[PDB]
Amino acid sequence: TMIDINVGGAIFETSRHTLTQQKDSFIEKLLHHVTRDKQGRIFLDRDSELFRIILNFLRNPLTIPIPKDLSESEALLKEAEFYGIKFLPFPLVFCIGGFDGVEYLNSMELLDISQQCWRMCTPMSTKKAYFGSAVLNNFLYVFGGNNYDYKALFETEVYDRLRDVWYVSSNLNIPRRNNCGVTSNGRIYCIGGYDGSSIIPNVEAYDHRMKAWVEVAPLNTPRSSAMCVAFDNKIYVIGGTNGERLNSIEVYEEKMNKWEQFPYALLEARSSGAAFNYLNQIYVVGGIDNEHNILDSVEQYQPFNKRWQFLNGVPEKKMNFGAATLSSYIITGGENGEVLNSCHFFSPDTNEWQLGPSLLVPRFGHSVLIANI
């Protein structure tokens, strides 16, 4: 069955199967009194050209659009989000930067799901470790860090996967390493770290309308190598060091621009691990404790019990690893005396860990970011 649709005055003719192959999308749902044109065709008051690109993708999903410039790339992704269209039916898992034992890295690895192995990807321009990272509108952001040229960086680089290019974005106000990065309600937060001389409490937010980083309310305790996770309009900043490694947690009420103390501290004071969340539960993994032991332990916060409890640990002790959450949780690389290339997946369904494919370049001080284009 063929359908004619009007988008921005332009007429597109296609099958219903083409427009509805992605279940629960806006276009699929749209197929109730809808606005129609003078010929009785479904009318959408949206950009014709962006729709033409998206439709040509739907006609052959094995080929991904190549936007002609940054503006079109951003516009295409926002338009696909509106229509509820994803250009790939799997996540893109990126391993970025870090330190291999002798050199700072600008290299990036991408998990190849069909081949079940990591592959080398497009490198960023600046080699660096211990930086903050976040995803915003499915662009990858990396900011701060250190390398051989600077003990504390202010540069922000951004990766556009559709055009396969890195570009330079806005400078941090306070150059820093061992800072946390997290996305919360459409902004990126750069949190704490070390400015080259001192551990700092400062927090900066990136707003993509402003195209700039601006200082917001600071942490109440300076923290470096902390762990952070954001959900339910809050940002949780967990552990880290102020000179001593901490079990305390701070919470940013994003809507109030205020930091508050979380009432329930970690069981093991620690820095240099990672935190993540699933549903309303918070998980903290790995890192190093205040007696300088490198950790494999995992802690889970259960809201019903209002306490942290241990789970089974990760299969090896590690700190300064890269990690990110999938729909699952992946941890890659890190260090524990040696430089690691190991990768493991955590399942909240079993609370157990599964071996994954190993990185091409053993590294620590790197980041993992996921794009869902």
Instruction: List Cβ neighbours of 192 (8 Å cut-off, separation of 6 or more).
Output: 176, 178, 179, 180, 199, 200, 201, 202, 203, 219, 222, 223, 224, 226, 237, 240
What is the bridge-based pairing of β-strands 10-15 and 42-44?
A: unpaired
Dihedral of the CA atoms 358, 359, 364, 369 (nearest 10)?
Answer: -110
Specify the CATH number of the domain 76-373.
2.120.10.80
Q: Which one, of 272, 293, 337, 340, lies nearest residue 285 by Cα?
A: 272
Q: How was this structure determined?
A: X-ray
Under a CB-based contact definition with an 8 Å cutoff, are residues 174 and 200 in contact? Answer: yes
Task: Provide DSSP, 43-102.
Answer: EE-S-HHHHHHHHHHHH-TTS----SSHHHHHHHHHHHHHHT--S-SS-EEEEE--B-SS
Q: How many residues does the chain have?
A: 373
Classify strands 307-311 and 343-347 as parallel, antiparallel or unpaired.
unpaired
Contact 361, 109 (CB under 8 A): yes
Distance CA 349, CA 104 (A): 36
Spatial strand order in the sheet of 352-355: 322-325, 329-332, 343-347, 352-355
Strands 42-44 and 2-7, how do they pair?
A: parallel
Contact (CB, 8 A) for 241 and 223: yes
3-class SS at 17? Answer: helix
| H/E run at residue 27 | helix 26-30
Distance CA 136, CA 170 (A): 14
Quick check: helix, strand or coil at residue 30? helix
Name the region of 196 (left: φ>0; alpha: ψ -120 to 50; beta: rest).
left
119 by Cβ neighbours in 10 Å (0-12 / 13-18 / 19+) ranks as exposed
Farthest-apart Cα atoms in the chain, separation: 75
Q: Single out the residue of 372, 285, 288, 274 nearest to residue 336, CA to CA.
A: 288
In sequence order, the β-bridge partners of residue 344 are 331, 355
Which helix H or strand E contains 167, and what residues bound it?
strand 165-168
- C-alpha distances (whole Å) from 19 to each of 2, 28, 235, 325 are 10, 6, 38, 30
Name the token pair of 235: 């940002």
SS3 for 16?
A: helix
Q: How far apart are CA 42 and CA 34, in angstroms?
A: 7
Q: Which residues partner with 165 through β-bridges?
A: 160
Q: Which CATH number fits domain 1-75: 3.30.710.10, 3.30.300.210, 3.40.50.970, 3.40.50.720?
A: 3.30.710.10
Residue 260 CA to residue 20 CA, distance in Å, equals: 46
Per-domain residue ranges of the chain = 1-75, 76-373
How far apart are the C-alpha atoms of 369 and 373, rounded to whole Å? 13
Name the amino acid, one letter, at 215: E
- In the DSSP assignment, the letter for residue 239 is -
Residue 116's alpha-carbon distances to 110, 111, 119, 146, 356, in angstroms, are 11, 7, 10, 32, 9
Are residues 301 and 275 in contact, defined by beta-carbon separation less than 8 angstroms?
A: no
- Bridge partner residues of 10 (DSSP): 7
